[PDB]
């Protein structure tokens, strides 16, 4: 069962935000990216978005987002995002997205409506971490198994929680309009609004679905009308004003927490050894940059660590006490000389 | 500024010090140790009884 997991985010709504770079410029968008985390080894990254996923206006793959206070929905396979190459969206749940695509320097996320394209790009570093000691850029078809950390594919109630807050007052210039001589305020049906003005003196009025006109005001730009909502909490976003008083009403769990799993890691080619009197030579040919670590079995190791990305030649000396080395991810190889 | 001081190992008594500066007024220090513990690092081997 998963509806009990989804129940937490039925209590919230999407929210408009500011994003520095839409397709035009400094902009207000529904897809503002708050933060990005890239700690998993296989390129799995977590995006914290301003929209909601998996909830209809319960459906599998959809994006639920906000338009000047009006909630709208789109199929999930329309939105895209990229850093340097086209990324791939896996799944979404609430304010979080799990993505799998290679390294880069900026995150761009975009989608296309019937005629208007929405997008923006944020410059937060995304890093690709190789496992083991064989640097690569795309995981291999075959190799061996290791234990690294990858981000879990499914949602569950973990010990990590976030905080919501009571929403603030949202100014909307659309509500206010000019009558013949007064200012007309038309709050939306089934919701309350707050009108504050200084056209004459200080004014404050809570209207509840009432079309009221105020005297002494001629132009409309003098003053403002807001929107009030009690339910449908919002995340502790830094891009919003806060409400009045203690701003705390619970917390929600964060899915897609990291976990331990089995990892495919490449295997380097076998180095060809040639032996001589108290010495060894390693004919060597790497497919990718790889680490040599070499040690002696005496009181002092003379440990040597080296990164090689080209064919090369190395001649090592070995004594009776012993020599040991690791190339790539092979088990360590120990050689022990003999009198001759 | 570094200042070294010596403390007798005995609780129940006060101890006064003055930190002297050539160009500034002396600074007082008052110290009273209340309780000192000498805890040993002990391991468990076995237990016996009737």
């Amino acid at each position, epitope marked *: 069962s998963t509806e009990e997991l989804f129940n937490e985010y039925k209590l919230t709504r999407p929210y408009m935000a500011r994003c520095i770079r839409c397709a035009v410029g400094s902009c207000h968008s529904p897809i503002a990216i708050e933060a990005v985390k890239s700690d998993g080894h296989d390129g799995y990254v977590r995006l914290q978005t301003s929209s909601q996923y998996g909830l209809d206006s319960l459906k599998g793959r959809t994006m639920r987002y906000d338009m000047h206070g009006t909630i709208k929905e789109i199929p999930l396979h329309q939105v895209s995002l990229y850093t340097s190459r086209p990324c791939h969206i896996v799944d979404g749940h609430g304010y979080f997205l799990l993505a799998r695509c290679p390294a880069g320097d900026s995150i761009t996320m975009e989608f296309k409506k019937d005629s208007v394209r929405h997008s923006c790009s944020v410059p937060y570093e995304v890093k690709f971490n190789p496992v083991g000691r064989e640097l690569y850029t795309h995981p291999p078809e075959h190799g061996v198994e290791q234990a690294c950390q990858v981000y879990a594919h*499914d949602a*569950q109630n*973990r*010990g*990590a929680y976030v905080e919501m807050h009571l929403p603030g007052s949202e100014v909307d210039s659309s509500l206010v309009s000019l009558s013949g001589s007064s200012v007309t305020v038309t709050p939306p049906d089934g919701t309350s609004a707050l009108v504050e003005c200084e056209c004459g003196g200080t004014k404050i009025s809570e209207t509840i679905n009432k079309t009221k006109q105020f005297s002494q005001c001629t132009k409309k730009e003098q003053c403002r009308a807001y929107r009030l909502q009690n339910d449908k909490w919002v995340y502790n976003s830094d891009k919003l004003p806060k409400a009045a008083g203690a701003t705390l009403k619970g917390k929600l769990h964060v899915p897609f*927490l990291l*976990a*331990d*799993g*089995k990892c495919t890691v490449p295997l380097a080619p076998e180095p060809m050894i040639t032996f001589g009197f108290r010495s060894v030579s390693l004919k060597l040919h790497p497919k990718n940059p790889t680490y040599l670590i070499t040690r002696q079995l005496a009181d002092e190791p003379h440990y040597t660590h080296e990164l090689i990305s080209e064919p090369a030649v190395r001649n090592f000396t070995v004594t009776e006490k012993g020599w040991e080395f690791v190339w790539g991810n092979h088990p360590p190889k120990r050689f022990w000389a003999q009198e001759t | 500024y570094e200042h070294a001081t010596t403390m007798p190992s005995q609780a129940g008594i006060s101890y006064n010090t003055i930190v002297n500066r050539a160009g500034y007024a002396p600074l007082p220090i008052s110290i009273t140790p209340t309780k000192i513990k000498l*805890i*040993p*690092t*002990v*391991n*468990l081997e076995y237990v016996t009884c009737h």
Partner: nanobody, 122 residues
Framework: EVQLQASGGGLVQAGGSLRLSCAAS????????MAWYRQSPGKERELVAK??????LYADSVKGRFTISNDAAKNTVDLQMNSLKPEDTAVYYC?????????????????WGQGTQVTVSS
């Protein structure tokens, strides 16, 4: 010297629900890592569960069928099992790592209990 005592388990039919309990006793005050490990015959040891304070972890083949709860006050970890499969036949061990002795002579880091055998019949 801290020791871990395991209890629970036993014989059951396919689809049953059991409980495993591991308790820590000795010169300990606070514990960090509660974990469970399973070892089937002819195979190496593997992790099944991992609990540490509020966080809990699960392996790939065991999601949605095992639940882990830790009580730091009693320093016990309880593993609730539901809807068991014939692949679950193995001996289960409980692990404790990151032990904080209350001075509390510093000693071995990790400890191990005897474990319990769990067998489900098809």
């Amino acid at each position: 010297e801290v020791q871990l005592q395991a209890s629970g388990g036993g014989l059951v039919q396919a689809g049953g629900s059991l409980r495993l309990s591991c308790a820590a006793s000795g010169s300990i005050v606070s514990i960090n890592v509660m974990a469970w490990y399973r070892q089937s015959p002819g195979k190496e040891r593997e992790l099944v569960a991992k609990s540490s304070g509020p966080f809990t972890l699960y392996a790939d083949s065991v999601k949605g069928r095992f639940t882990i709860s830790n009580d730091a006050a009693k320093n016990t970890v309880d593993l609730q099992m539901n809807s068991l499969k014939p692949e679950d036949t193995a001996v289960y061990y409980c692990n404790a790592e990151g032990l904080r002795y209350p001075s509390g002579t510093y000693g071995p880091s990790a400890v191990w209990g005897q474990g319990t055998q769990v067998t489900v019949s098809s």
